[PDB]
RNA sequence: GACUCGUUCAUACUACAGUGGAUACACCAGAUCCCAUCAGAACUCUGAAGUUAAGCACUGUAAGGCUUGGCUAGUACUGAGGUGGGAGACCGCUCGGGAACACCAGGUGAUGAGUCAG
RNA sequence: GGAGACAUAGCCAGGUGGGGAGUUUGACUGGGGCGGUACAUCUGUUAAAUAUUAACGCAGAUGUCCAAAGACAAGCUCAAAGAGAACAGAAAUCUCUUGUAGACUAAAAGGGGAAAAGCUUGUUUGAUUUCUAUUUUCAGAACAAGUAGAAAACGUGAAAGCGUGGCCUAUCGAUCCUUUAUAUUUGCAAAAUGACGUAAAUUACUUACUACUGUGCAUAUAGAGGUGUCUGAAAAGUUACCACAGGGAUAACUGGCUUGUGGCUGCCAAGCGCUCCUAGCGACGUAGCUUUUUGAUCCUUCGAUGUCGGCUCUUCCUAUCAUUGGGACGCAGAAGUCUCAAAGUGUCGGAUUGUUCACCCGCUAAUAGGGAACGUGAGCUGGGUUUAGACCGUCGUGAGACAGGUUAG
RNA sequence: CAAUGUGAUUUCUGCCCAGUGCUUUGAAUGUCAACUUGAUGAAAUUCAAUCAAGCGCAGGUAAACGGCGGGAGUAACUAUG
RNA sequence: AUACUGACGUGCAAAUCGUUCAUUUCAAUCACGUUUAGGGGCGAAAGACUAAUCGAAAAGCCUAUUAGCUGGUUAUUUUCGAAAGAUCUCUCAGGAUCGCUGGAGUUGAUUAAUAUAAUUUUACCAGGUAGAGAUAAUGAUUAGAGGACAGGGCCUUGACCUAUUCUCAAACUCCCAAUAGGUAAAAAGGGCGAAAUAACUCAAUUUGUAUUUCACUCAUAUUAAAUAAAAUAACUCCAAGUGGGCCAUUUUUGGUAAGCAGAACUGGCGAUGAGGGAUGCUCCUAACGCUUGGAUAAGGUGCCUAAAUAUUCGCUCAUGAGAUCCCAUAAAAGGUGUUGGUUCAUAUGAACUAGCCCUGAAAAUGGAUGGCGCUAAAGCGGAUUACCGAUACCAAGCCAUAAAAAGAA
RNA sequence: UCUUAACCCACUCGUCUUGAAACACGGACCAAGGAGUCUAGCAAAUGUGCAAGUGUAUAUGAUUCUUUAAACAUUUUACGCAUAAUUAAUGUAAUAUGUCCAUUGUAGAUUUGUGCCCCACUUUGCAUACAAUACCGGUAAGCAAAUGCUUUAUUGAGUACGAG
RNA sequence: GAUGUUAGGAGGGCAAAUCCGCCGAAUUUAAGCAUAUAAUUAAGCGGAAGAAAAGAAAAUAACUAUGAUUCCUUUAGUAACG
RNA sequence: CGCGGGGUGGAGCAGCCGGUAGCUCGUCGGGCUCAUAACCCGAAGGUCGUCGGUUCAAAUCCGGCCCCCGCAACC
């Protein structure tokens, strides 16, 4: 007559049947939600570090290669 | 609920500074006979048969959200501002 | 179901005994930021950045900090899966977690043990104790220090 | 000896008493100007005449509270187990964990930074 | 003869129009309908010390209100009690003292809140524009409600700071459609609509150079108008004249669990019983038994277990009404009462009823109480409830309805 | 002639036009369409204006549909009113 | 064609037959001819009749209409193997999307370890239920005592204060568990240093920050606490079935109660069985390829019926004895029946107590410890051994599947 | 092999159903016929061919003319889809050398080396994951004499030496 | 415009697959239903041929333009309608 | 949503026609008749619903709302 109301039965057991999954993204939390201004300053730093690195890498490769 | 009829506030157009706006009550335009949907509604209605286009015969609400039309007194441009659903609204009354 | 935000007020949100408006200076100043683990505890004073019910007493990593806000990565079980959720909370709500402090003290103590062993060029283990089974022992017992027990009659 | 900024936020509270005032605090003296109120009460400003009478510092009291510990009690309570008991209500037992009030005894603070006078 | 450019007829147009047509007549629901809303939500509790959690669970609340009751600062401390002041002891007062919140915080209940989130005052409008990461509900979509920020412009204190509405948990709505804002962005399809604008040139169908160009319509973006059966059909009744698809996933019947209710037995001892608790009783209590009542119920049967009563006819029970043997007595005899072993034996004639039951009259030895699929429809009967005809009343605009009466089936 | 109702004789057939109907009057009358006319605009358009019936107002109508309450005060006892 | 609700009711008959009754000179009856045709006719009106057909004929076609609903839905072996929760739905017999399932692929696993784990360890937390309290607050709430104003007639009765006092709430909270739950345990990282980079920060482009490059170096032969047929793990895809559940213990809400309605945690059943529980979907033991042997489990061992008329100490006689969880009744109340105790009094008198046994103990086909029977038990309570006892378990064989070895004269 | 025996076991099958031996339903018996298909359009999977292309479409050609109703060939530079995207829409649509070259990290298959083999160091660094920057279309904001710009925001079924 | 058994002739009817004209629905679909759909289809009444119909510009384009009809391949499940 | 009309002492209602707001009824008192009574007077009494304005004077007229009930379109 009435349809069922509460029941949460078997669901825990079904969850344990396929195991209770956990996240695995791990390293390098990312993109838009990163701190305004500070991360842009980091981008500029990284770009600076990259420019110094690129200058070293280009010179070192070019001198040896030819 | 009661508002005064002027407000000094940010204009979102041209002037960046806070400046005066007049405050008034929007109340919905009278419908055009030239609107494309109204043309379609006319076309569907014409000839034999009934109709579906906007009607409701079982209305729930006794109230309307009030939206104020704010007119910048500097640059002569308008902006809408929406606020709570009321039964009772008052303009310029004070206490 | 019929579930608004703060439901279970008389349960969790109820203040600690005589704890009103606690806001002293030392509360703010901890600073370990982006790597740190942090507990999320309710404050009786502060309503402004109060968490949802589930996050009370839970712990997770800080991933973002602002002027007096903290983003905290907290684990939540959602039916068949535990998933990481980005909980925005306030400075009053975050409490520095102590699990890190246990690891650090053990690292420091073990490091001192390692350093001592290294100076001597010793071969020894800095690994934690198991609290193993008790070995043999001895006590000398006069007739005066030993007591005879028996069950008790009803009285 | 004193103060300032504090910290923990009652061992730091409250009540009734007593003891203490170099330097200090405060009570105290005045309203032109800065200021502020119906009101120099408070608040602001300007004084420095008196005084420990209070605040303040410290102690005391079959003080109250708070506060630790014992003791209440392996009691109450409790997870898992049992083709255990009990007609039912319920109660033992195995493996484990385990209170609270009352009561009794103790206690009534500790402390970072700076300064000033001895 | 008569009427006559009016009629009439045609085509448009408004009305009238259940005569006729086509269609609608929710869901939850301890059957359905009536009733309610548990259908969108919010609080406390139920909830089993994270989280989750329902019932037509319980205690409730919602569809607002607020230019301040919003914002920031500054100042102050409330309810109450005592002692004083001709007026508030005793219709909303005045003072001092005591006062940890016993006040107050719009409502709604709970949380939170005392140099304040209360109260008073000052100055105010951020109840702003733009954009995220997100949290609640959650599929981890929406919307709605939030949190933490950021790009702006400001407000307030000006001093740190704080302000993206309401102390917190509650106060609400998609697409299509309509409507108004906004743009140095667009379109209306071979072309053009400011403007021969600005220069030159002029033997002209001249040549350059120009960031901002007709009405009307269409967009794009942003709000608002609404969907409470609240993830959003333009929707009333009725059928005992009915048809069909399914249903024991769901009523009316036995049976079954239960035995509240009905029925029956107890224990007790305050009283009643002349005196006397118990010969007979038995309150105020408390314990069982039964299914001979009715419920509660919805397990069984809905591709049919024939739905009342009577008759007939038999068997079984005992909780014994009489009959036998007895015990007790408030048993003088005679009556008669309580009672035990006892189901061996019996338990009627009629009046009135559709009737179980009921209610009389008469006999009698007493005219006991019950079971058997509510004993007994391929045993009957068919009077009643309960097919279609018909009647009166009420109720219904109506069709019709009526565990209303009535006649016929 | 058509449309209805009640249903021999005998006897009587009260009250009520609000409601729903049906129906009647209108130089006072509120509203109410197509067309047409005018105004407006460069045109499209947008507006006004007019003397339809209808409904409404105002009457008539119950052998039209139909229907037929509640109180108070009040008679030399109570009572009824 | 009124009645006998006659006969008949697998007929003589898809309405017959018998008997009864009504009609008979008129609104009469009968024929033949004629008229009106399907939302149509015709109707002294019954939704009547319209060719055995009527609340919309018959024929054919549109048509193989439609259907969240009913029924049916075909060879074998082998393998993996469920759901009866959820969310939205004019939604409760359905659908969609999550969950749980299978396939297919990729990833990396082979190094007895790392990832990893329904787990514990040691750290570290979160709690306000069990519990406990009223002299902590709230709501209650029964009594007296000690005190300095009120009511009644110097007294009494009160209120009111103060110390007290009785009982309280799971919708109250001073305090407060166990269980369950969360975070933690180092090499893609961490240490301590230098140098770099910036448009952030800070007087302070090495003040901090963060990042980077260089260093120096952290246990690990096994280990940064255990334990782990821990990669059978991950991850991606595509698709299925399912969306009604039901049972048990413990906790539990409504309802007198219910094999009633509704849950929580777990395990079952469902979809799954062998042995026991006489018997039986769920209780117990235990989950299954095919066989042989072994030894046991639950459970038993008088006979039915396989093993003991076993041993050992008690208790028990019943004119309805009693006999094993789920399991199919029995209570208050008694008992100069017997058995143990224990408190008391003076080898005796009391009083209690709990074991058994008894009264209390009534019901429908005949009737049920499963039956016979059993009392020097084969009853009830122990204990002591032996034996029998599953497809589980051990050993062996054989079958297939899975994985691993291993191979191109 | 068949056949009774005897001991032990053995309840109507199918069915919807929580639960069927049921007092639930269908089935007197036997034979034959009798039910997940075909087309269209879409998807993933796997096989197969070719590849920045691919598919010969319609159609033409032939000593093709029992089979031949297919098989064969493509003129002695069409169309589908993929080759860059975006968008209401006019439109716009570079990761750049100013050794063919030259995107940045961290894990990570594979390779070089050292000290008749696993190794422990180094060495190179695919795929993929996890990020990072650019840059292109939309939308902002800021500027603005358009090859309209711009540090900075956002958004797209985006792109970063083609995969279909 | 009549009349004629005037003279010479014609039409009528049947059959229907493909073809052409009128007239012309509902089941159905939307999990309901009224617009849309089914469908300018089915039925109905007519007319033809071995094929008919259409056909020699009151066409398309905006190009360096094409140039009666039919048909196939296509555009294209696109513009668009709802 | 856009058109028409009504709100006046305790009740019924005139004034809506810009030179100053009343009249019945029920109440409250008083005359009149030898009666009762009927009759006839005198009293009380209202923000002219809320609001903005036109001048010499405004409930009344212009401006706009609120509460009431008539027409409607929408369909």
Q: Which of residues 47-76 of B touch strand E (CB under 7 A)?
A: 50-65, 67, 69
Torsion of CA B40, B46, B47, B53, to 10 degrees: 70
Cα separation, A14 vs C91, in Å, equals 39
Beta bridge partners of C39: C59, C95
Query: Environment class of residue C62 by beta-carbon count within 10 Å: exposed (0-12), middle (13-18) or buried (19+)?
Result: buried
Transcribe A8-53 into DSSP letters.
-TTHHHHHHHS--B-----S---GGGS-TTHHHHHHHHHHHHHHHH
Identify how the structure was determined.
cryo-EM
Q: Tell me, in Å, how far CA of B85 is from C1' of E243?
A: 54
Helix (H) or strand (E) holding C106: helix C99-120
Nucleotide nearest to C46 (CA to C1'): E112
Distance CA C76, CA C51 (A): 14
List protein-proximal bases of chain J (any atom < 7 A from a CB): 74-75
Contact C77 A22 (CB under 8 A): no
Q: Is the CB of A53 under 7 A from strand H?
A: yes
- How far is A46 from A52, CA to CA, in rounded Å? 10
Give the span between the Cα atoms of B1 and B86, in whole angstroms: 8
Resolution rounded to one decimal, in angstroms: 5.8
Round to whole Å and give the CA distance between C27 and C46: 13
Beta-carbon separation of C82 and A20 below 8 A: yes
How far is the alpha carbon of A23 from chain C, nearest alpha carbon, in Å? 6
What does the block give as tokens for C1?
A: 């179901």
């Amino acid at each position: 007559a009435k349809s069922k109301n509460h029941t949460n039965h078997n669901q825990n057991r079904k969850a344990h049947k396929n195991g209770i999954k956990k996240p695995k993204k791990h390293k390098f939390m990312s993109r838009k939600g990163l701190d305004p201004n500070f991360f842009r300053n980091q981008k500029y730093c990284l770009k600076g570090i990259q420019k110094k690195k690129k200058e070293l890498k280009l010179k070192a490769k070019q001198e040896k290669n030819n | 609920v009661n508002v005064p009829k002027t407000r000094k506030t940010y204009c979102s157009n041209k002037c960046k500074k806070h400046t005066m706006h007049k405050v008034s009550q929007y109340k919905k335009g009278k419908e055009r006979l030239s609107s494309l949907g109204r043309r379609r509604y006319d076309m569907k209605q014409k000839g034999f048969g009934g109709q579906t286009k906007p009607v409701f015969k079982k209305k729930a609400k006794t109230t309307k959200k009030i939206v104020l039309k704010l007119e910048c007194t500097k640059c002569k441009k308008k902006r809408f501002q929406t606020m709570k659903r009321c039964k009772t609204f008052e303009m310029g009354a004070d206490k | 179901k019929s579930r608004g935000k703060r439901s279970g007020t008389r349960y969790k949100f109820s203040k600690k005994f005589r704890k009103h408006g606690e806001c002293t200076a030392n509360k703010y100043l901890e600073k370990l930021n982006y790597g740190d683990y942090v507990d999320i505890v309710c404050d009786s004073t502060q309503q402004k950045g109060m968490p949802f019910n589930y996050y009370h007493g839970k712990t997770g990593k800080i991933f973002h900090i602002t002027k007096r806000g903290v983003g905290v990565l907290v684990n939540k079980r959602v039916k068949h899966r535990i998933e990481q959720k980005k909980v925005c909370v306030r400075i009053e709500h975050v409490r520095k977690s102590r699990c890190n402090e246990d690891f650090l003290l053990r690292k420091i103590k073990n490091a001192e043990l390692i350093k001592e062993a290294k100076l001597k060029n010793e071969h020894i283990n800095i690994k934690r104790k198991t609290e193993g089974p008790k070995p043999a022992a001895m006590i000398k017992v006069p007739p005066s220090k030993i007591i005879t027990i028996e069950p008790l009659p009803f009285y």
